[PDB]
Amino acid sequence: MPVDFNGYWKMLSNENFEEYLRALDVNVALRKIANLLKPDKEIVQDGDHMIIRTLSTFRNYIMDFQVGKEFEEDLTGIDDRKCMTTVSWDGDKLQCVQKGEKEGRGWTQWIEGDELHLEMRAEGVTCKQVFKKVH
Question: Is 63 annotated as a binding residue?
Answer without folding.
Answer: yes
